[PDB]
Symmetry: D2
Subunit: 51 residues, 4 copies
């Protein structure tokens, strides 16, 4: 294993593992976004009922 | 009073746009993951 | 061996695309925030 | 404060507060993305040096 070979390996492994983290973090953003949408919808329908 | 209702509708439609953009980010992320994984395996094979 | 290098270049360019898309999500988020804040204030004023 | 008025208020306040959370969560994703980019760049330059 040359220096460049090992580095390429470290880099690919880290990226493989960090993309799973990013995906999981996206799941969390989607949950917030959906809750924001449901609140926005109740907000709109409350405003419609007012005016 | 007509504008508070136009504002609420606008916020509702922007959250729909958010959702769509997140799904496109997620597609890019899984593609990156799949390529990272392929490259890793074929590196772990050769070295 | 020519394809491991084409793969690495592709992963690098996809992370640049990721960054750009995140900035566009962030623009949408701050806009949503600014409208949410305006609506809140003008509601807290009227009621 | 009518029922619809209060709801509109709750909804707008929650959305105001949740958008700050989303923004902060985006800051975290950007940090991961930049680290992914730096690793991808080292990966590429390591591969160039190899081949």
């Amino acid at each position: 294993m040359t220096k460049q070979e090992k580095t390429a390996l470290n880099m690919a492994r880290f990226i493989r593992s960090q993309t799973l983290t990013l995906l999981e973090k996206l799941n969390e953003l989607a949950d917030i976004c959906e809750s924001l949408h449901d609140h926005a919808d109740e907000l709109y329908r409350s405003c419609l009922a007012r005016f």
